[PDB]
Design a protein around this ligand. Sequence first.
Ligand SMILES: *S(=O)(=O)Cc1ccccc1
Ligand SMILES: *S(=O)(=O)Cc1ccccc1
Ligand SMILES: *S(=O)(=O)Cc1ccccc1
Lengths: 114, 114, 114
Amino acid sequence: PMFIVNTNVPRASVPDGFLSELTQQLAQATGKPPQYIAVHVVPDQLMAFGGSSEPCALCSLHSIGKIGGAQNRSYSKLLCGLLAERLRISPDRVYINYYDMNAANVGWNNSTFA
Amino acid sequence: PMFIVNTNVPRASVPDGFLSELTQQLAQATGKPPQYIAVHVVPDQLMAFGGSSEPCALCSLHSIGKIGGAQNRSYSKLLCGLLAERLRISPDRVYINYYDMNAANVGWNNSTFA
Amino acid sequence: PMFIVNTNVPRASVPDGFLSELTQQLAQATGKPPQYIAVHVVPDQLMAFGGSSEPCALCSLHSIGKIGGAQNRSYSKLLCGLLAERLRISPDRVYINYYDMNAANVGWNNSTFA
Ligand SMILES: *S(=O)(=O)Cc1ccccc1
Ligand SMILES: *S(=O)(=O)Cc1ccccc1
Ligand SMILES: *S(=O)(=O)Cc1ccccc1
């Protein structure tokens, strides 16, 4: 699976260990081995949420399976939790798009997962 | 809903009120309250359209509902209009990906919209 | 169609001609006229793959049609080949999300492709 967070929070406010913590926590949350987890953080963005430029984040989680009503609620609690504690972003200023990708539609290592 | 514009236009050429205008125009266009609108502008990008590095933009609009054939035509006229007026990007050098998201697949405020 | 690559490889390591090569090769591979191909490269990203910050990439290819099991395998071989040769990124550290977009959901030139 892969997780991306885009935020207006400045690079200096992203703590050491953040990508590692996302990697570990997402492995645990999704049940994908950590070797598979891709994470990507994009600070210093020009973004607004409700017309306000206070800290916010626009994120995505793509996975082959492990995506669903209850699971996505759980991921959102985990991830908003991390963004609040680590980046000081209010959970109500975070959106996370979830994508259940078909294996045929995910490329890797010169091929796809199909 | 959330709107993202990625462009090779330089940051200095993005007008100061651009995020606020997008927010207001999208609230009007989608009928969603302005409090929910997220907007994200990413200038200075290394991109090409048809092999040319003249101004261009790659955009997305995600919404829970309010996505469809006629609506997307209307959004495309509105958004190309704004990109042309404010960023001086030709409409034929703009792509906008529209996504009709399920409420269960949009995380917000420690949960999802489901 | 449109191709985006986000990578932690630094800007200076992206060779001259890279976007043109992607344009040409994607025209050949997808069959789409070169004039319609959009390409976007985002270097210097803060990312990890399997907990490691060695070179990696997260990519996407959106197309109206020309997406499927065999086709995506072919795209993946092409694109991982290019990322390896040009950016020195190992194929097993690349993910590519493939999207078969409905024409009504792709805006261009004040309207959509529908
Ligand atoms: S993960 O193990 O689910 C692999 C993956 C899935 C979807 C997009 C990118 C990577
Ligand atoms: S909007 O009010 O439609 C909320 C939203 C929908 C989809 C993605 C992100 C945010
Ligand atoms: S391409 O010729 O397929 C046009 C396109 C399709 C999907 C997204 C963006 C552009």
